[PDB]
Design a protein around this ligand. Structure first.
Ligand SMILES: CCCc1ccccc1O
Length: 163
């Protein structure tokens, strides 16, 4: 297991524009196109992203390309973030994948806020961190996924994905 395989399990692969768990237009491997309810605004974002007129459909290769960029951006975002970087840098590599997954799904606004969970993770109070993480809209909206990512944080193992 690695972060791509992890996110690919969590995000799926769809080649046609679809609405994600939040109702937002998305393609590929959880590549969010827009929060606009306008399908055309999503289609314009898709075409901008891919550099061609996709008419709401892309290839597997184009999906993996966006995905590569999205993962890379998630990491680079964490490393740019004063609240996140010290925590992420304190983690072993399996728990770092958990962090990337969370930021991929939620965005770095979305989690830089998780102050208590961040402190606990930094402290390596894994069971406590895991309890705190689940106390969230995140967990309640996507519990099956959040359970897997929390287990990754709690154990620093790939047990929740292995599978
Ligand atoms: C509760 C935050 C878990 C986390 C730690 C470090 C970087 C990104 C993360 O989402």
């Amino acid at each position: 297991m690695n972060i791509f395989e992890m996110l690919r399990i969590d995000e799926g692969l769809r080649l046609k524009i679809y609405k994600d768990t939040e109702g937002y237009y998305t393609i590929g491997i959880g590549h969010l196109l827009t929060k606009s309810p306008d399908l055309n605004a999503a289609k314009s974002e898709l075409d901008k992203a891919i550099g061609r007129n996709c008419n709401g459909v892309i290839t597997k290769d184009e999906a993996e390309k966006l995905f590569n960029q999205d993962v890379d951006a998630a990491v680079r975002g964490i490393l740019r973030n004063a609240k996140l970087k010290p925590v992420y840098d304190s983690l072993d590599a399996v728990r770092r994948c958990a962090a990337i997954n969370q930021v991929f799904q939620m965005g770095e606004t979305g989690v830089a806020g998780f102050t208590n969970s961040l402190r606990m993770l930094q402290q390596k109070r894994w069971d406590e961190a895991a309890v705190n993480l689940a106390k969230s809209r995140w967990y309640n909206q996507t519990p099956d996924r959040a359970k897997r990512v929390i287990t990754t944080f709690r154990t620093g193992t790939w047990d929740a994905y292995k599978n």
